Nucleic acid binder design. Structure first.
Ligand SMILES: [Cl-]
Ligand SMILES: [Cl-]
Ligand SMILES: [Mn+2]
Ligand SMILES: [Mn+2]
Ligand SMILES: [Mn+2]
Ligand SMILES: [Mn+2]
Ligand SMILES: [Mn+2]
Ligand SMILES: [Mn+2]
Ligand SMILES: [Mn+2]
Ligand SMILES: [Mn+2]
Lengths: 97, 92, 78, 105, 104, 92, 96, 79
DNA sequence: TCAATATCCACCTGCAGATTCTACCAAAAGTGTATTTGGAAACTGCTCCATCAAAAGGCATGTTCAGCTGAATTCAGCTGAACATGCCTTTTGATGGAGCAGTTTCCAAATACACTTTTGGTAGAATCTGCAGGTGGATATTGAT
DNA sequence: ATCAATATCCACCTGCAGATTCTACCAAAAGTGTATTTGGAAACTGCTCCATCAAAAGGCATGTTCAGCTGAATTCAGCTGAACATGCCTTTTGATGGAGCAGTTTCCAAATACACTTTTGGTAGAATCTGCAGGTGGATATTGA
């Protein structure tokens, strides 16, 4: 009987998804989120499917290179785990909030 | 000859703080501001018209550009004043 | 629906970022950042939408919304 | 003979705004309310920076606004700060700000 | 006959000249400007396809997909600087794990 | 009724890699890219002329813009390619 | 004999220079540098005095919010001293 | 060789305006090099604008345009 | 320090979905002629830049000395990873209808031109006048104990 | 939480360099009237886009266990801050000569506007191929011991 040492599988998943290109959030919840947010700015709005597509590509990209930066802050504090104060600094030093 | 926003800026100063003045270096900073905000607003209204295959920049483009380029509350006030001025101006 | 952005989906995103270990507090944090981002992009896109007197948000509206935030996107027009 | 600016109730020059728009390569034709609307907005934002700078100039017990005051006025205003976030005011300095950690016990 | 033929180019000198004239860039457009700009667009386009085609064949495919474009841009010191603020849809990221996170 | 850079890109593809093809999603990206760089070079050359009280965008504005907008080695080559093309065009 | 505890004077200098607006690098050394850098790019070149003026306001303005960012990275690693790996991280997340 | 003209104590003042309380000895050579790179990019663009205008003198406006190009808009030299 | 499970990497295959490759018709692109016009050439009053002399005080440099910082070591609780069952929410595919874009047509109102007057905004002069330095009394700061 | 020795703050002073006025032209708005566009109201036609519905099915939520990582904690060699004294160089300033600006004309070369005449590039079909994705054969990765 044999089982992955913590950290091993995560490294195998890093290699797995840096290698791949598909959208990583489930499409329907995401779509639901877009429409909700939109309905607050204005009701009765409609979306080309490619508009939600475009919103998702952009969103997953922005979240991915934020984790790249968050990770760098986590390393800088001689840790291996990302933590909320890591994403807060990362965001802080890119002017974005 | 070198035109500038100096006199117009000065008048607005006397409107908000009548007994207050302004150094020339500070005046150039304000001058810079107006050119900067102008080019921001104009250019974005340029791009708006261009996307809508329209060849005219109208005040409706200026307003929408202000709604994009200005942070929430700043824009609300600006938009009221922008509106208030063309409707006053059409009646004259 | 923000809760529909699930824990393991966020984990995959982070793995694409080379993140190896993740605090449990990252997920509600991440949700909050995604929400702010969408709120700013969609608001600018809709503002482009209503300007054209339309009721339908096109891909180009979003593409323009992203260029405004300094996030040029390729593959839906420009 | 009335100024285009007076009909609008404005202090900024609508005719100049209109000229800079036309000679500025922004679009082929320029609407009649466009420079009126723009000048009003330019004038509003100028009012807003000058009011808050004037306040900072009196807090400094000066009666003439200098660039330091404009800097203190922008950076201390949440929204003006966002608007001019990529902008350097020469001879303006920075806001007084020490990170709590660096303070004594 | 085509202006594009007279210039030694594959991009359309004529379209460029129109897009410049109708683009609200200036009242007048010089005659060599659209040739020059078309040539630059061709050059940059040539260089990306050169590197994308290569990146597809290193992967033993013979059709360029967005991944190949992404890998080509991000692996190029200078192209990457040029398109540093650009997201390529369906491109993924470069394979890159921080050394500190490896075992040993 | 709806123009694009797709055919010209394909032609250029066939020069560098005659046996290689390109998916449609990849072509929309190449397209996006071509429009992007155009507006960049066009916009900067627009600004150049306006800063100089000039009303013609010439090949010299284009070249100066490329020198601003492109990274070093990349710019060197494009300036070479752009010149090489305009000088050829004069001899015809 | 009476003397400042390390850091006390340091805190007093931060307060002092956040209060002022004067250029903090010496003008003539700076000028000498600009022209040196400029001459490698192109020879026989001249500068308006404000051209060098603008170059310096800009330069300092940039270095100052770079130290601000460098300082934040330093706090983030629970130190108080800024160090090269602080300026390196800061620059990396600023596009640079 | 003028880069040594940015002195250690001058850099400190800048750090003090940046809110720095304590400073490593490796920061100064590090700070100088960063400064030299910044100027090299600004000056080159500024010079490109200068030579385009067929001038032999770098104006203040060249620098302001060069800076606006790097996303660093600057106020007080417009007029 | 080596061996057994598993896993991924290698190479191979026949086709549906995508990509190529073809076959007409507007709408751009190209031409021909007739004008404009922007901006290069050649010259020129004048800034504005470059040096220079050099005294003179302000800042930098280098050494000493002390306290406190960051780097290094150890260690326990507890967080977050790995895994499996099970159920649900998503995905997927076809369908239907209604609300929109998008296509053209066609005039009113809006904008651009082209000239003729009417001022306002600018550029130097000619005036005022806040603020820079300098100084004397208070109040804060800081280490010492 | 009391103290003496310092540093800093706040206001006043006066002479001036820079800010505000004040004048006297001149481009540039404003004014009128004529010549064009344009964007928009209508009417019309498809296209998408919203909304169902109903399967499998793949992926999320939950629950269990434990490795190892993060946070708490102790000590120290030397790193850096603070102070001093010594000395170098930056700053200041007033004057000059000329280089290199702008400013003014002058005038073709180059670019725009129309009006006709080809050619191309875009679209909808007609005719093609590359991977995908199984199957399962030599290596790679992993952890147990
Ligand atoms: Cl530590
Ligand atoms: Cl004390
Ligand atoms: Mn999800
Ligand atoms: Mn030309
Ligand atoms: Mn219908
Ligand atoms: Mn004083
Ligand atoms: Mn006395
Ligand atoms: Mn005293
Ligand atoms: Mn004085
Ligand atoms: Mn179980």
């Amino acid at each position: 009987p044999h089982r992955y040492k913590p950290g091993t599988l995560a490294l195998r998943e890093i290699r797995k998804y840096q290698k791949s290109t598909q959208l990583l959030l489930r499409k329907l919840p995401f779509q639901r989120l877009v429409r909700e947010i939109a309905q607050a700015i204005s009701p009765d709005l409609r979306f080309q499917s490619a508009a939600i597509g475009a919103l998702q590509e952009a969103s997953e990209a922005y979240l991915v290179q934020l984790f790249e930066d968050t990770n760098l802050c986590a390393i800088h504090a001689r840790r291996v785990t990302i933590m909320p104060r890591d994403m807060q600094l990362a965001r802080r030093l890119r002017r974005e909030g | 000859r070198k035109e500038s926003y100096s006199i117009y800026v000065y008048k607005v100063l006397k409107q908000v703080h009548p007994d207050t003045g302004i150094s020339s270096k500070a005046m150039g900073i304000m001058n810079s501001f107006v050119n900067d905000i102008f080019e921001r607003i104009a250019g974005e209204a340029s791009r708006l018209a261009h996307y809508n295959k329209r060849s005219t920049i109208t005040s409706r483009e200026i307003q929408t550009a202000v709604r994009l380029l200005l942070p929430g509350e700043l824009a609300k006030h600006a938009v009221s004043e922008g509106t208030k001025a063309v409707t006053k101006y059409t009646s004259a | 629906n923000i809760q529909g952005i699930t824990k393991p989906a966020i984990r995959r995103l982070a793995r694409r970022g080379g993140v190896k270990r993740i605090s449990g507090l990252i997920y509600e944090e991440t949700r909050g950042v995604l929400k702010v981002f969408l709120e700013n992009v969609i608001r600018d896109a809709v503002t482009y939408t209503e300007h054209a007197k339309r009721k339908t948000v096109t891909a180009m509206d979003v593409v323009y919304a992203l260029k405004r935030q300094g996030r040029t996107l390729y593959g839906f027009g420009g | 003979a009335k100024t285009r600016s007076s009909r609008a109730g404005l202090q900024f020059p609508v005719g100049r705004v209109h000229r800079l728009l036309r000679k500025g390569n922004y679009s082929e034709r320029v609407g009649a309310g466009a420079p009126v609307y723009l000048a009003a907005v330019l004038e509003y934002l100028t009012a807003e920076i000058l009011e808050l700078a004037g306040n900072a100039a009196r807090d400094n017990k000066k009666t003439r606004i200098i660039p330091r005051h404009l800097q203190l006025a922008i950076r201390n205003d949440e929204e003006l700060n966002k608007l001019l976030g990529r902008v350097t005011i020469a001879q303006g300095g920075v806001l007084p700000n020490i990170q709590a950690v660096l303070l004594p016990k």
